[PDB]
Amino acid sequence: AVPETRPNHTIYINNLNSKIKKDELKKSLHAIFSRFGQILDILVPRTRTPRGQAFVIFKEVSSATNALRSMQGFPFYDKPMAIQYAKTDKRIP
RNA sequence: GCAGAUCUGAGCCUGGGAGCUCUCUGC
Protein backbone atom coordinates (compact mmCIF):
# COMPACT_ATOMS: atom_id res chain seq x y z
CA ALA A 1 0.00 0.00 0.00
CA VAL A 2 1.36 3.42 -1.07
CA PRO A 3 -1.37 5.95 -0.17
CA GLU A 4 -1.30 9.70 -0.60
CA THR A 5 -0.66 11.25 2.81
CA ARG A 6 -0.20 14.69 4.27
CA PRO A 7 1.25 15.80 7.59
CA ASN A 8 -0.89 15.04 10.62
CA HIS A 9 -0.50 14.02 14.25
CA THR A 10 0.02 10.32 13.55
CA ILE A 11 2.87 8.40 12.01
CA TYR A 12 2.64 4.81 10.74
CA ILE A 13 5.75 2.70 11.23
CA ASN A 14 6.37 -0.66 9.69
CA ASN A 15 9.29 -3.02 9.11
CA LEU A 16 9.36 -3.35 12.87
CA ASN A 17 10.97 -6.35 14.48
CA SER A 18 8.20 -8.88 15.06
CA LYS A 19 10.24 -10.82 17.65
CA ILE A 20 9.81 -8.05 20.24
CA LYS A 21 7.00 -8.33 22.80
CA LYS A 22 4.30 -5.74 22.20
CA ASP A 23 4.64 -4.20 25.66
CA GLU A 24 8.40 -3.75 25.22
CA LEU A 25 7.88 -2.42 21.71
CA LYS A 26 5.48 0.25 23.05
CA LYS A 27 7.90 1.30 25.79
CA SER A 28 10.81 1.48 23.35
CA LEU A 29 8.86 3.50 20.78
CA HIS A 30 7.75 5.85 23.55
CA ALA A 31 11.28 6.34 24.85
CA ILE A 32 12.74 7.06 21.43
CA PHE A 33 9.95 9.15 19.93
CA SER A 34 9.13 11.21 23.05
CA ARG A 35 12.21 13.31 22.28
CA PHE A 36 10.23 14.91 19.42
CA GLY A 37 7.33 15.95 21.65
CA GLN A 38 4.43 14.77 23.75
CA ILE A 39 2.90 11.47 22.63
CA LEU A 40 -0.80 10.84 23.12
CA ASP A 41 -0.80 7.14 22.36
CA ILE A 42 1.10 4.32 20.73
CA LEU A 43 -0.95 1.69 18.91
CA VAL A 44 0.26 -1.76 17.96
CA PRO A 45 -2.73 -3.35 16.22
CA ARG A 46 -3.36 -7.04 16.55
CA THR A 47 -3.15 -8.72 13.15
CA ARG A 48 -3.83 -12.32 12.17
CA THR A 49 -0.05 -12.84 11.88
CA PRO A 50 2.79 -10.64 13.18
CA ARG A 51 3.49 -7.90 10.69
CA GLY A 52 5.67 -5.32 12.44
CA GLN A 53 3.33 -2.32 12.33
CA ALA A 54 2.67 0.52 14.77
CA PHE A 55 1.19 4.03 15.03
CA VAL A 56 2.53 6.89 17.15
CA ILE A 57 0.06 9.72 17.84
CA PHE A 58 1.75 13.02 18.76
CA LYS A 59 0.10 15.97 20.50
CA GLU A 60 1.57 18.38 17.88
CA VAL A 61 1.90 17.82 14.11
CA SER A 62 5.39 19.37 14.13
CA SER A 63 6.50 16.55 16.44
CA ALA A 64 5.27 13.99 13.90
CA THR A 65 7.00 15.85 11.08
CA ASN A 66 10.37 15.92 12.88
CA ALA A 67 10.08 12.26 14.01
CA LEU A 68 9.26 11.12 10.47
CA ARG A 69 12.27 12.91 9.06
CA SER A 70 14.79 12.09 11.76
CA MET A 71 13.95 8.45 12.30
CA GLN A 72 13.31 7.48 8.68
CA GLY A 73 15.32 4.36 7.93
CA PHE A 74 16.96 4.36 11.36
CA PRO A 75 17.72 1.00 12.97
CA PHE A 76 15.41 -0.02 15.75
CA TYR A 77 16.04 -3.44 17.19
CA ASP A 78 18.35 -4.10 14.23
CA LYS A 79 15.76 -3.31 11.52
CA PRO A 80 15.42 -0.03 9.58
CA MET A 81 12.17 1.72 10.43
CA ALA A 82 9.94 2.64 7.49
CA ILE A 83 7.84 5.67 8.44
CA GLN A 84 4.91 7.49 6.83
CA TYR A 85 2.26 9.87 7.98
CA ALA A 86 -0.96 8.07 8.74
CA LYS A 87 -3.52 8.00 5.94
CA THR A 88 -6.09 9.27 8.41
CA ASP A 89 -5.15 10.97 11.67
CA LYS A 90 -5.78 8.73 14.69
CA ARG A 91 -5.91 11.59 17.21
CA ILE A 92 -9.22 11.73 19.10
CA PRO A 93 -10.08 15.41 19.88
C1' G B 1 -21.50 -3.25 22.79
C1' C B 2 -16.56 -1.52 24.92
C1' A B 3 -11.49 -3.16 25.94
C1' G B 4 -7.89 -6.96 25.54
C1' A B 5 -5.71 -11.85 23.73
C1' U B 6 -2.13 -16.01 18.27
C1' C B 7 6.19 -15.80 16.07
C1' U B 8 2.50 -17.97 22.94
C1' G B 9 -6.18 -19.24 19.82
C1' A B 10 -8.40 -20.04 14.53
C1' G B 11 -10.51 -19.72 9.36
C1' C B 12 -10.09 -16.65 5.26
C1' C B 13 -8.36 -12.66 1.84
C1' U B 14 -3.72 -11.02 -0.16
C1' G B 15 0.72 -13.22 -2.67
C1' G B 16 5.56 -6.77 -2.86
C1' G B 17 0.27 -7.10 4.23
C1' A B 18 -2.44 0.08 6.59
C1' G B 19 -7.57 -6.46 4.59
C1' C B 20 -12.04 -9.50 6.69
C1' U B 21 -14.37 -12.78 10.01
C1' C B 22 -14.43 -16.02 14.14
C1' U B 23 -12.99 -17.81 18.94
C1' C B 24 -11.40 -16.82 23.98
C1' U B 25 -11.00 -13.44 28.41
C1' G B 26 -12.73 -8.99 31.31
C1' C B 27 -16.45 -5.35 31.89
Numbering used by the authors: 2 to 94
Sentences from the paper on this structure:
The viral trans-activator of transcription (Tat) protein uses an archetypal arginine-rich motif (ARM) to recruit the host positive transcription elongation factor b (pTEFb) complex onto the viral trans-activation response (TAR) RNA, leading to activation of HIV transcription. Using yeast display and multiple rounds of selection, a new class of TAR-binding proteins (TBPs) was identified that bind TAR with nanomolar affinity. Although it was hypothesized originally that each TBP variant would recognize TAR using fundamentally different modes of binding, we demonstrated here that each TBP binds TAR using a conserved subset of arginine-to-guanine interactions within a lab-evolved β2-β3 loop.
ITC revealed high-affinity TAR binding based on a KD of 4.2 ± 0.3 nm. As expected, the co-crystal structure revealed an interaction between Oγ1 of Thr-48 and the carbonyl oxygen of Thr-50 (Fig. 3 (F and I) and Fig. S3A), as observed for TBP6.7 and TBP6.9. A second interaction is also shared among TBP6.7, TBP6.9, and TBP6.6. 2B and 3 (E and F) and Fig. S3B).
